[PDB]
Design a binder for this molecule. Structure first.
Ligand SMILES: [Zn+2]
Length: 433
RNA sequence: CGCUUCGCGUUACAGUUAAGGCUCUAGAGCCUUAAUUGUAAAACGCCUAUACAGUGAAGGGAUAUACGCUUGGGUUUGUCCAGCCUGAGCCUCUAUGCCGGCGCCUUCAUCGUGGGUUAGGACAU
């Protein structure tokens, strides 16, 4: 009995099916929803880790400055100590601190810039502080090595690590800005020009400030706009992330032959395997046809596909059907493909595990306050949500808040809630229920 | 998946200022709410003492070194991991921070007591 389990893996939903290949009977067919909340949770972890390690570095800098200043005779009371210890909590940026994310971060930088200073300002301020406090010059020079000190090393050059795709080498892929010579040529191999012209284009695009010859060639030669964009991405050194798999396999990857993967992808695959282990109990599948996508003559094995095959063998022929046959037998057996349809995923899993014939008669079936016994935490006017405006303890600003959220239904500056030193939004105490 | 500060915000304490009042007899005190200044905390825990930071000097720095490879250790638990930190030869793969000046290797004095991780993915319960 050829019980073949077919798994169609989308970016969000996943279809599972088990098709007895005699008479193309279907013994199991199901859909499953994958966890899409893991990347945001990891982003929350990254933000929390950055906050905690910034606080820890602040503690280390404060302890070091306190120890040094008490060593050179500047006790806590010293008017020369309090000024320097006050500027230690606010040392400022040392000029060392897709479009939506850029726009978003750009605003917070300006937000930080509108209410902070440059390292040089806090430093010239500790200068004037210790130049009238009789600190000679060496001691002021030694507190500049505490203000302008990095405690945890900033190591970001070789962190995002990707292995190769061809599966017989899992070596470290280089960054896109290191193997540009192997990158640009990967474009020009599929070009209808002479090899000498290929080398001339290599020399022109590969920096050397010779983009005018690149533009002249591109005006002269008929070349696609996406290839135009890729070449100009190579030439302008705007490349980000690692290269598309290792150097010896950039130019040759037409032959076939995984502990590292995205943890969101890993937990999606494990959820699918959790459902698979609920298929495994009552069905012994002798073969597995899997096509893992987003939504022969195929491309290389996907990292999620490879991890899925390895974990399926751990929990056996596990093949990957081409998209041509699956797409053909799909619409030809009725209906078409819909992105985000769970039924479509289930029926693609049914088709994937089915024994194909040829010429339609086979496929059957933040801390809080605890004063006076009542909880009252402070929330900014931006952080106060509608419906819960009555929890504000401040009766002086309660009417003002509700009126602004009704009369006016930037708005805070219009409503006059930017009353601070740097015109920041004020915060009100709200009674937590 | 990740490094890193700049902040913002929260809580706790100690002050100051501005309103809106309760009590004593124009004044005094404290009640709330805003703003402002200063300090501290932001996991608990686990693991470091053979570890970690500072100080000054000789040493290497594209035939150093490691964020790179192999194998461990901490986090690490009921169990396995991810990430981060790190030991040890490793240099095959990964690559270079800054304008000799950063990191690194020992070394006295190290009096020091400091350091890493920290609620995320699965199974069982
Ligand atoms: Zn390769």
């Amino acid at each position: 009995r050829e019980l073949v389990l077919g798994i169609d893996y989308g970016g969000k939903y996943t279809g599972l099916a088990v098709v007895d290949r005699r008479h193309n009977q279907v013994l199991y067919a199901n859909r499953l929803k994958m966890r899409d909340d893991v990347a945001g949770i990891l982003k929350d972890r990254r933000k929390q880790r950055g906050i905690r390690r910034t606080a820890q570095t602040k503690k280390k800098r404060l302890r070091e400055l306190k120890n040094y200043l008490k060593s050179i005779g500047y006790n806590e009371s010293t008017a020369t100590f309090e000024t320097v210890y006050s500027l230690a909590h606010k040392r400022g940026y040392d000029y060392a601190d897709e479009r939506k994310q850029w726009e978003k971060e750009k605003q917070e930088w300006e937000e930080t810039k509108r209410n902070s200073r440059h390292r040089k300002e806090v430093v010239k301020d500790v200068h004037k502080a210790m130049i009238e406090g009789r600190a000679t010059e060496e001691q002021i020079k030694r507190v500049e090595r505490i203000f302008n000190k990095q405690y945890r090393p900033k190591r970001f050059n070789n962190r995002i690590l990707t292995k190769c795709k061809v599966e017989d080498c899992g070596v470290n892929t280089p960054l896109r800005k290191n193997v540009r010579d192997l990158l640009i040529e990967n474009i020009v191999r599929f070009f209808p020009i002479e090899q000498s012209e290929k080398d001339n284009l290599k020399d022109a695009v590969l920096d050397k400030n010779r983009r005018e010859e690149v533009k002249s060639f591109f005006r002269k030669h008929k070349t696609d706009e996406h290839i135009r964009k890729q070449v100009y991405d190579i030439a302008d050194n705007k490349l980000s992330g690692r290269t598309v798999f290792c150097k010896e396999h950039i130019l040759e990857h037409t032959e076939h032959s995984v502990f590292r993967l995205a943890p969101s992808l890993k937990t999606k695959i494990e959820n699918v395997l959790a459902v698979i282990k609920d298929e495994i109990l009552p069905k012994f599948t002798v073969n597995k046809v899997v096509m893992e996508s987003n939504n022969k003559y195929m491309s290389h094995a996907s990292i999620g596909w490879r991890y899925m095959r390895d974990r399926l063998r751990e929990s056996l022929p596990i093949e990957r059907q081409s998209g041509i046959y699956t797409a053909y037998f799909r619409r030809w057996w009725g209906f078409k493909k819909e992105r985000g349809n769970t039924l479509h995923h289930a029926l693609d899993a049914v088709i994937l595990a089915s024994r194909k014939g040829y010429s339609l008669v086979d496929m059957t079936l933040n801390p809080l306050s605890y004063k006076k016994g009542i909880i009252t935490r402070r929330f900014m006017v931006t952080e106060i949500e509608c419906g819960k405006e009555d929890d504000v303890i401040s009766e002086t600003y309660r009417e003002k808040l509700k009126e602004a959220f009704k009369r006016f239904d930037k708005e805070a500056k219009e409503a006059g809630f930017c009353i601070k030193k740097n015109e920041l939004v004020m915060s009100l105490k709200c009674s937590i229920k």
